[PDB]
């Protein structure tokens, strides 16, 4: 946590920016799949 609790970020956030950045990166066919596998697809809907 240099900023993963010290400028916010969690390991979750930090990491998630990483993966996200990996998704940001990566080649596109894979990036399609991004949003699938491990691409956050939470629907934050209380019920």
């Amino acid at each position: 946590v240099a900023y993963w609790r010290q400028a916010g970020l969690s390991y979750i956030r930090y990491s998630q920016i990483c993966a996200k950045a990996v998704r940001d990166a990566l080649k596109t066919e894979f990036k399609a799949n991004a949003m699938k596998t491990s691409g956050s697809t939470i629907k934050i809907v209380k019920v």
Binding site: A7, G8, L9, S15, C18, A19, A25, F30, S38
Partner: protein, 131 residues
Amino acid sequence: QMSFTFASPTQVFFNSANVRQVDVPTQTGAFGILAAHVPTLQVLRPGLVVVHAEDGTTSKYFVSSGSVTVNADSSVQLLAEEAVTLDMLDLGAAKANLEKAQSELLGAADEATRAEIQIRIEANEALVKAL
């Protein structure tokens, strides 16, 4: 002589595989974990995963992040966030992203954003590393 569990959500790359070492861009510093390794969790940097499999292999990866979980016994569990073979990572993007990154940083006002940006930079950069 380590049961290397190398997995990502998407993949298990090595699963309790008799790897001799994994050289670890654990947030730590360069460390080449062989075999059993002390219960410690050390969290992983974006880096490369080099899987010195007990056999000369080093399997290549770039890793986004994640955690290494070093379970006392023979087992290592690299739970790498996005740890991808460099194959599927995109050099063109690494620089481009890095420029772009540099653009972003400036707007990555607020360390939490920055953190992400510097991260991105770091990432893109880190992509520039090997790519």
